[PDB]
Amino acid sequence: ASAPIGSAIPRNNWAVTCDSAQSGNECNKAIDGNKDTFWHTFYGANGDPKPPHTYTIDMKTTQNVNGLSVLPRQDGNQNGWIGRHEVYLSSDGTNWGSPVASGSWFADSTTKYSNFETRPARYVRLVAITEANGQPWTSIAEINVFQASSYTAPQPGLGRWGPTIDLPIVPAAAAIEPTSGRVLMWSSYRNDAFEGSPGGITLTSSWDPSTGIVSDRTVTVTKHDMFCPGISMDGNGQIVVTGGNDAKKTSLYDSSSDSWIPGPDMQVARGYQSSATMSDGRVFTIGGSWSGGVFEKNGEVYSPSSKTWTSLPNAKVNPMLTADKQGLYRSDNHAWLFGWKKGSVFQAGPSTAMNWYYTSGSGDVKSAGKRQSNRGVAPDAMCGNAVMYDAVKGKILTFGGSPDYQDSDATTNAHIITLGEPGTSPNTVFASNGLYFARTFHTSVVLPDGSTFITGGQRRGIPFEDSTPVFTPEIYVPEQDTFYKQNPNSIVRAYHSISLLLPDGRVFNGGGGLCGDCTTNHFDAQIFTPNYLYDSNGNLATRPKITRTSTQSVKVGGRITISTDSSISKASLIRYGTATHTVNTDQRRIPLTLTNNGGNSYSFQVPSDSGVALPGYWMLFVMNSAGVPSVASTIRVTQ
Numbered sequence: 001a002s003a004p005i006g007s008a009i010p011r012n013n014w015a016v017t018c019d020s021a022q023s024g025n026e027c028n029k030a031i032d033g034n035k036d037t038f039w040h041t042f043y044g045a046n047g048d049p050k051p052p053h054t055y056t057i058d059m060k061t062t063q064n065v066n067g068l069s070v071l072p073r074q075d076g077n078q079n080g081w082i083g084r085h086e087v088y089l090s091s092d093g094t095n096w097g098s099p100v101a102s103g104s105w106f107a108d109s110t111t112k113y114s115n116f117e118t119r120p121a122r123y124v125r126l127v128a129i130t131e132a133n134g135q136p137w138t139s140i141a142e143i144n145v146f147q148a149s150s151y152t153a154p155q156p157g158l159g160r161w162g163p164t165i166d167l168p169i170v171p172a173a174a175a176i177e178p179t180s181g182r183v184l185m186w187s188s189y190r191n192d193a194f195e196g197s198p199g200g201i202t203l204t205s206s207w208d209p210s211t212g213i214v215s216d217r218t219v220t221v222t223k224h225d226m227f228c229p230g231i232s233m234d235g236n237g238q239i240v241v242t243g244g245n246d247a248k249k250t251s252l253y254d255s256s257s258d259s260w261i262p263g264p265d266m267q268v269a270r271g272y273q274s275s276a277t278m279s280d281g282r283v284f285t286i287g288g289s290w291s292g293g294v295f296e297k298n299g300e301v302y303s304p305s306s307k308t309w310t311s312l313p314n315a316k317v318n319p320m321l322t323a324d325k326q327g328l329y330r331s332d333n334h335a336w337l338f339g340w341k342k343g344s345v346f347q348a349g350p351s352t353a354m355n356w357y358y359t360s361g362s363g364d365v366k367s368a369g370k371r372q373s374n375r376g377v378a379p380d381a382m383c384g385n386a387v388m389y390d391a392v393k394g395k396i397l398t399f400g401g402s403p404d405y406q407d408s409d410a411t412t413n414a415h416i417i418t419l420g421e422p423g424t425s426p427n428t429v430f431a432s433n434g435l436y437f438a439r440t441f442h443t444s445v446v447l448p449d450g451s452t453f454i455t456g457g458q459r460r461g462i463p464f465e466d467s468t469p470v471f472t473p474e475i476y477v478p479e480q481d482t483f484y485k486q487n488p489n490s491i492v493r494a495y496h497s498i499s500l501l502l503p504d505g506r507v508f509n510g511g512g513g514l515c516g517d518c519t520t521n522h523f524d525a526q527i528f529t530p531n532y533l534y535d536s537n538g539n540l541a542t543r544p545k546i547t548r549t550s551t552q553s554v555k556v557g558g559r560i561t562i563s564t565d566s567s568i569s570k571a572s573l574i575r576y577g578t579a580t581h582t583v584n585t586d587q588r589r590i591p592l593t594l595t596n597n598g599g600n601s602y603s604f605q606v607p608s609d610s611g612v613a614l615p616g617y618w619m620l621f622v623m624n625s626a627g628v629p630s631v632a633s634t635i636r637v638t639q
């Protein structure tokens with residue numbers, strides 16, 4: 001099922017109002033503690049008024065509210081389930097502001113939840129915008145509101161969490177659809193479970209940042225349960241999703257048509273492998289013993305043009321194996337892969353040993369030295385993160401993780417790896433003094449300004465358990481070689497969580513759980529709004545606008561000219577992201593060297609090396625002197 005982040009507020013002195021209520025199904029039947037009694041909107045002789053329907057609670061005194069729950073009817077009647085919905089909070093009961101949570105609940109009779117950042121409130125309003133299957137009515141057997149033990153105002157300057165997006169699935173895998181700006185998410189054959197899958201089915205959900213709409217789809221056309229996969233956006237602008245619950249399958253998500261297309265089977269059956277897009281737009285993958293068997297799974301490569309997978313048996317997985325106590329099942333998982341120059345793939349970890357993978361002929365692998373610093377050799381860091389925040393300079397920030405996949409203490413270890421040419425051993429140093437909080441199963445994104453946002457995880461890796469959670473995110477700022485704590489959130493984001501950078505410059509962070517009838521499923525996501533979007537008073541800052549681009553599709557080495565509505569100081573390209581199981585091999589950042597044409601006209605060149613400027617979709621951000629980024633302009637980079 002799921003759970004609230006708080007404890008239930010006693011209701012015996014509550015006053016409640018509903019937009020309509022049938023006799024015998026009064027508004028207060030939803031708070032009488034009786035699972036068999038329910039509130040129901042008008043029907044029959046009273047007519048059948050359609051949604052939106054509304055439930056409003058006066059709790060009389062201020063509570064530190066951090067969620068609510070809805071228990072549906074328990075008599076088998078399915079016609080009043082709440083679909084699309086919004087949650088509002090108020091101190092006076094007249095002014096409600098923006099929803100603290102909104103989204104869509106799955107169509108079944110299970111208890112639904114809305115979890116969100118703690119906010120003092122006396123009044124709580126639930127708006128049922130649709131019934132789950134489009135019927136006129138709304139009903140609730142029991143509604144509860146939850147409180148945190150305390151409330152602390154966010155500190156000025158450290159960003160902001162909210163709102164919550166409520167979802168019909170646990171989003172354990174996600175990607176940005178670059179042509180539409182929507183967030184694509186998926187779970188498995190079920191909304192919150194992967195166990196005992198017959199295969200051939202993936203449940204997906206999407207969220208549109210522009211409209212707030214949550215939608216969902218059942219994908220069977222690719223005959224692929226895409227839980228636990230490799231994910232890469234290839235040079236043809238299609239997301240290549242590999243293996244997992246159906247360990248040999250390849251599915252292709254096409255953003256332009258918003259559809260899924262069958263791909264060729266991989267040569268080797270895999271799950272929990274990483275895949276990485278290459279300089280030529282192809283996709284490399286290696287490892288992945290979670291599914292398809294436990295044995296040495298060497299490299300293979302996908303060609304989007306020929307629609308083939310070809311084995312690269314001499315791209316050996318052995319040199320990148322961790323020393324996981326559980327053995328090969330875990331040790332070849334979630335490699336920190338980055339496409340690089342001349343068809344190569346850099347493997348930065350999680351193993352202590354770093355390696356170069358090559359894709360010519362039948363493949364090759366060469367040692368790149370050990371991840372290390374003057375503090376010593378870095379231990380295996382399974383489910384640590386790796387982020388290429390300056391591709392032009394070859395800079396990769398690595399952090400967190402634990403020596404074993406589970407039942408292992410995470411660390412604060414963090415490094416800067418500086419890539420040169422394939423086959424050379426990169427310089428590695430420690431990043432600052434490491435993380436503030438040791439964490440594994442955390443997630444991260446590079447931001448327009450080159451800083452890396454790091455969020456969630458737990459101190460000791462225990463899949464499906466929300467213990468030792470880390471609620472305070474951190475940002476690494478490369479120019480200062482310093483980490484900074486940001487404002488904390490209140491929802492655990494550990495195993496099976498994701499983060500992605502949105503085109504509007506905010507961070508989408510969600511998921512966690514996906515373990516069936518476990519209590520740790522998180523059917524939601526939250527927005528983190530970084531400090532660079534706020535002015536000194538804590539209000540949203542005015543953002544520079546890109547008013548014209550000379551072109552939206554460019555070959556590597558090509559130039560783009562832009563106009564802005566105000567002077568800008570910096571610009572960057574950020575490749576669109578994909579995410580699952582801590583892995584995001586698609587994001588990376590290119591800082592741009594600007595030519596000032598005068599009159600707020602600027603030009604820049606896309607790097608000529610497609611191992612740096614990986615083909616695919618990128619976000620163009622410009623920043624003003626105050627450090628405020630524009631929203632992204634979408635650029636396609638080709639080779």
Ligand SMILES: [Ca+2]
Nearest residue numbers: 029034037141
């Ligand atoms: Ca009841």
Ligand SMILES: [Cu+2]
Nearest residue numbers: 172228496581
């Ligand atoms: Cu998993």
